[PDB]
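Standup notes, structure subgroup. Blocker cleared on the 6L5 input:
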Amino acid sequence: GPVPFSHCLPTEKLQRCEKIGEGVFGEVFQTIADHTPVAIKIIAIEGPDLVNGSHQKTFEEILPEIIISKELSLLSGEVCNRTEGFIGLNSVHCVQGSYPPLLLKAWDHYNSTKGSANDRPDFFKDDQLFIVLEFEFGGIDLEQMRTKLSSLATAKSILHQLTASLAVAEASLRFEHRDLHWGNVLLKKTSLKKLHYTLNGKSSTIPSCGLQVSIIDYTLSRLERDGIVVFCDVSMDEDLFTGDGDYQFDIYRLMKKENNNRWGEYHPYSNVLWLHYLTDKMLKQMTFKTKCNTPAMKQIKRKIQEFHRTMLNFSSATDLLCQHSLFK
Amino acid sequence: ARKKQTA
Ligand SMILES: *C(=O)C[C@@H](NC(=O)CCCCCNC(=O)[C@H]1O[C@@H](n2cnc3c(N)ncnc32)[C@H](O)[C@@H]1O)C(N)=O
Ligand code: NA
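Run returned:
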């Protein structure tokens, strides 16, 4: 049976909530438990009425994200195909009740400072169900770090980390992320000089440049285990393919072209498309604290430019990681 | 941006 909000958010945890993100169907908060930050994603489910102008999702509709979140989190503890590049999943609960007054307070503070596109979540009744996903706190999204990175050497570590994580997930799970825009890439400081992964039993390292990248958000993602495929069928979606004003919105169309609008199939080229979009952001929209002033830094810039103009001729993140000159 | 927006 469902639990009260108190189960996920005891008082001290609830009292420490700050809102960090939102979308059509959810709210994301940061809080603290045992001296450690975590991120809480809260989705209303199963009700007949509108939230932020759209119908609530059913449990069936959210289940794929729950499943995929868990499978990708478990890659940190695997052997042949091992990566910590996906966000850790701590717990998932089904909760019943009105929205806590303490979360409303957090919601109000975000609306005052950043502005919300969503309704104030104060209208839910005591029978309302929610899914509450608790994750590792992954740092700050790449979009919000547009003006905050040291140099293009950092961008290279970020791209290498992303390619490796995706390669490991391809190998283990026939994974496609399918929505890896720059709000779904998180950066956190790390003291580790290098990060470790294992791809089909071969272990390697990546220089961190002081950052650990985490991938999040699996609403559009696809994977499989023992031939059972978990994915989001967007073949009849009326607006996913009609966006404009950012290369991001072309990627949805280019995915649909690659897969012939058959979303259950495996087309790991979609991971390449997203990595090309990310590289394009690094070269065009990111602005660095230190530019490429030295010949050595101009060289890194040239290698990332070369990656950008060649990577679309690779068939998967695995092909990119194993064969592309950038990662030698 | 989010893939779908409120909106
Ligand atoms: C497709 O239709 C998906 C749909 N999703 C939702 O509406 C559900 C809510 C989406 C929330 C989007 N915003 C974020 O995820 C931002 O919150 C921050 N963030 C998320 N998770 C973390 C973790 N683990 N640690 C730190 N920060 C996190 C981050 O700033 C994200 O960009 C839709 N229409 O979006
Ligand atoms: Na992780």
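Discussed briefly. DSSP finds nine helices and 14 strands in chain A.
Next: hand off to the docking folks.
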